[PDB]
């Protein structure tokens, strides 16, 4: 415990971190689909 978090606290943080990152990447994908529909670059 070099950060002072126990294993339960780490599990909790990890759960919410992974959920948030997944939601963020979803929004990124949506932005790119719109951009491809408007101005395809490849």
């Amino acid at each position: 415990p070099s950060t002072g978090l126990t294993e339960s606290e780490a599990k909790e943080f990890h759960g919410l971190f992974m959920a948030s990152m997944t939601l963020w990447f979803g929004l990124v994908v949506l932005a790119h689909i719109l951009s491809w529909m408007y101005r395809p670059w490849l």
């Binding site: 415990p1 070099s2 950060t3 978090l5 294993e7 606290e9 780490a10 599990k11 943080f13 990890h14 971190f17 101005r39 670059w41």
Partner: protein, 73 residues
Amino acid sequence: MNAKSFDGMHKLWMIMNPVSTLWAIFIFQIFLGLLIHMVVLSSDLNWHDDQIPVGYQLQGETLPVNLEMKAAQ
């Protein structure tokens, strides 16, 4: 292994500080956002100055009122 190889992963936050990491991630994301927008604006894909769907400065120079005033001088 290869199915349950990433089960210890939650222990990451017992060696890395969560709040420091959050702040680092946010700052890096903002910097990268600004950078990619500036890189795409400096290419052929630029969307502010492409005069689509219309050029507005040129539209203002050729209004009938402005033309009639510029004729009178």
